[PDB]
Design an enzyme around this catalytic site. Structure first.
Site, PDB file in Angstrom:
ATOM      1  N   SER A  31      -6.079  -1.230   7.182  1.00 25.55           N
ATOM      2  CA  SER A  31      -5.884   0.203   6.564  1.00 25.55           C
ATOM      3  C   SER A  31      -7.252   0.288   5.506  1.00 25.55           C
ATOM      4  O   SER A  31      -7.012  -0.509   4.702  1.00 25.55           O
ATOM      5  CB  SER A  31      -5.403   0.578   6.068  1.00 25.55           C
ATOM      6  OG  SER A  31      -4.419   1.236   5.614  1.00 25.55           O
TER       7      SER A  31
ATOM      8  N   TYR B 274       3.091  -3.473   2.543  1.00 23.73           N
ATOM      9  CA  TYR B 274       1.964  -3.122   3.501  1.00 23.73           C
ATOM     10  C   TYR B 274       0.782  -2.966   3.498  1.00 23.73           C
ATOM     11  O   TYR B 274      -0.473  -3.511   3.588  1.00 23.73           O
ATOM     12  CB  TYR B 274       1.921  -0.922   3.697  1.00 23.73           C
ATOM     13  CG  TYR B 274       1.266  -0.571   5.189  1.00 23.73           C
ATOM     14  CD1 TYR B 274       1.515  -1.030   6.601  1.00 23.73           C
ATOM     15  CD2 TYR B 274       0.581  -0.037   4.518  1.00 23.73           C
ATOM     16  CE1 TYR B 274       0.313  -1.119   7.217  1.00 23.73           C
ATOM     17  CE2 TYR B 274      -0.610   0.711   5.272  1.00 23.73           C
ATOM     18  CZ  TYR B 274      -0.719   0.439   6.719  1.00 23.73           C
ATOM     19  OH  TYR B 274      -1.337   0.629   7.805  1.00 23.73           O
TER      20      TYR B 274
END
Ligand code: CA
Ligand code: CA
Ligand code: CA
Ligand code: CA
Ligand code: CA
Ligand code: CA
Ligand code: CL
Ligand code: CL
Ligand code: CL
Ligand code: CL
Lengths: 262, 260, 260, 262
Positions: D147, D161
């Protein structure tokens, strides 16, 4: 001072573009730390005013030299003056830079070449001019003023400017290796949004709006840049080389304005 | 009052009894900081604390802590607050670097290295967070590595993963803690000479050094000096930065690009 | 109609007659693109064009161009538009890599390398910009290098500076040209086998290859294949990326970290 | 197909988290390209529906395997099924990942360990499970779904995350070296903001607001990620290894919202 951590007393420093803004911030920190400081700039009135102020801040000698950093021979003259007055040069803060805007669609060859002449050639020439002295130092230091704009971010109107600021880091990555046998470190600072006298002309509302995009919630100061330059110039930072460090209050981190916590 | 003053600043160093962590703790102790060193072995903690307390006017304490246990991190923070009155700086330094080829690495090896290197980082920061908020000039300094964020090294894919994880944590934590005036930065040590590494002998070290532009391994104090700078009031506008302290190790395209 | 279709796409390749640029031009010609190759030597241009025109259904043209001259870039764009009806892709590939130690590098050496490597990049994009806007799916692909953005190599501080400058340009140009549906990306070749490099002989190449995890130098077509992908409609959401094509060269901490 | 550039016909692909969102986008592109595709997921209903659709898109075989990627033994079972049905594995798309939020101040050990178990251990285990087959391939490919959040950006609520997504790249940088003697490349994709069925539940206004922070002016699609994964999986991408590539419409570039051109 001797026996203190991060001693810079009697260290000899050349600061290009050292009369205003971030440059003056770097020169000021060095002056307060007891360093000898040669400030270079284009306007003799600005140089003399800066020198008068800085000489009072500490025990080092401060001088001013009118220098167009885009001319190698004037960079040589600047290094020569610093060697004549101080006996040597331990630190070059290749800080001179300009940031005129030009949309890509209209940017002329004159605009492109002009910003490179100051921002890139002035960086190379300042370092080359001081190189013999930096070698003689035995603990030499090159500190480049780059920007978050180019190496990390983009900003329409500043594609040439960002190209110059990234160019400085490409130079750094090779110069750090090339100069390592001489015990010279080569590092860079990437300022984010720093409050300067120039920027204050735009007024309080404009600045507050810019501050809302920064996690820190405020613009930084010229001394924020100067304090990092000072650290990099210490004996204690001798194993740091080839690093570009952002001083930006977290400006580059948020994924968007929605990611800013307050 | 001087430039870069750390006198009376209160610091917690995890894995602070050996190697790089001891280097961090030492520089802070010399600067007049109060220092809490955490470690796993009570004999190493007591020896470390005895030496550090002599270096400066600050109070030094030692706390046996397994950083992989959130509760033990909370207890370490509690001790620092009780003894110093607060915490201004957490150096989340604790970390291990066992090797495991990817082909054979077990779940136990993967989970273990993450528990120390990554969970220990979150937990140390979380444990100290209330104190760091109370500080008003709080500082988080993570000890990462060039290995992971920048380089790779076969046998250390898990380690590199933990080191890069720390920087992923950093980039959010810097934003999330900014409203509290807490900066969050990371140091990426290269090859640093430690007592552990000297057991390998001088020929091994010299060989390693030939791959570094600086031509020598760095020292633990090199890491400590950068941590000390980041911890100053003067470094308040620097956050979310990972800074390599590696003598130029990551720069050369190959051995052939090293000048001498 | 197929996945990754480039048939009838119109491409300009600067420095397209040799080496990496010829690799780029070749992959586009095989994909059925119209290709305008620019170069300095009319003999190399004519030879290149003769070979490329045979590779696919697209029209190929050759234009003698000094990319350091904005007017000559404008003329190259004009020719491509006249002959193809438009320009969908500019590969700003032209670049030189003379060496100069920092200690001795002259103003003439510094300015010269920037004129080609950097001004040539701006000018090639600017010259093609009106056509790229008219395209509706325009693409700018810059040939940068690992040297500058990632690594250093003594003798090439100026070159590295130019290569990193291209990426600084990219990061703004990607934003500035987004409203026009033009993506702007960069390729960072590592060590690529070219005819020029084979003049040095097989022992020199083998030595270089031992420093690469892949264990071989790459090919010009490796660069061309990535350029071709970036140029597809399928790559429309990728912009401002610099992508290394280097067989893992930049990853190892040192020669010692290479597995075999 | 053979004789085409970027041929993937008959290549054998395992996609973890391949039943929805970005994973389904990757699986779909591979299926259209003629690849054999094993999709893994947690819900048998989602798996069977995805397999039914994908098997129709091209000449390759498509199978579905219920797999909790956080369990090494289930990853081994997944690799085993793909080898039994396809004869081998040429590509592993380690895509499975979750993104629950947790403020740092409240994040529990359970939240921290849970997201790492899926996002990191599932990446390691998927690769290890497929490694023997990837070796046997001779042109093996590992494609990680990372990401922009972690490696590049920060976003309050997602510190865990982001830590997982950066961890994947630290793994990559070593795995690329370690697996290079076997001719396996190891690359990563960093998606920005991608339109998924889940995100559409929030409605058109929410998405349009997010789009205004993106230079491209729109969110990307799952096939944008799939097309890059497909490219990396080709023979033609064989000299690309250890690269993390953002597919984000320029999201990470602007210095702030003020830097976005429209
Ligand atoms: Ca004075
Ligand atoms: Ca004491
Ligand atoms: Ca071992
Ligand atoms: Ca033809
Ligand atoms: Ca030469
Ligand atoms: Ca089928
Ligand atoms: Cl750069
Ligand atoms: Cl990272
Ligand atoms: Cl760059
Ligand atoms: Cl990373």
């Amino acid at each position: 001072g001797p026996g203190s951590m991060f001693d810079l007393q009697g260290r000899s420093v050349v600061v290009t573009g050292g009369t205003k803004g971030i440059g003056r911030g770097i020169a000021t920190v060095f002056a307060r730390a007891g360093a000898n400081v040669a400030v270079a700039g284009r306007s003799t009135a600005d140089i003399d005013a800066c020198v008068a102020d800085l000489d009072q801040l500490g025990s080092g000698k401060v001088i001013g030299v009118q220098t167009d950093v885009s001319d190698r021979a004037q960079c040589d003259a600047l290094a020569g003056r610093a060697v004549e007055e101080f006996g040597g040069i331990d630190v070059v803060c290749a800080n001179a830079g300009v940031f005129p805007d030009a949309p890509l669609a209209t940017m002329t060859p004159e605009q492109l070449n002009g910003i490179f002449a100051v921002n890139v050639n002035g960086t190379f020439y300042a370092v080359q001019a001081c190189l013999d002295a930096l070698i003689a130092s035995g603990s030499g230091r090159v500190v480049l003023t780059s920007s978050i704009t180019g190496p990390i971010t983009g900003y329409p109107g500043w594609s040439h400017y960002g190209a110059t600021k990234a160019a400085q880091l490409g130079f750094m990555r090779t110069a750090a290796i090339e100069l390592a046998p001489h015990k010279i470190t080569v590092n860079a600072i990437m300022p984010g949004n720093i409050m300067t006298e120039g920027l204050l002309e735009n007024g309080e509302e404009y600045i507050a709006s810019m501050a809302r995009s920064i996690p820190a919630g405020a613009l930084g100061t010229p001394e924020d840049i100067g304090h990092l330059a000072a650290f990099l110039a210490t004996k204690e930072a001798g194993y740091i080389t080839g690093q570009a460090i952002a001083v930006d209050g977290g400006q580059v981190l948020p994924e968007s304005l929605d990611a800013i916590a307050t």
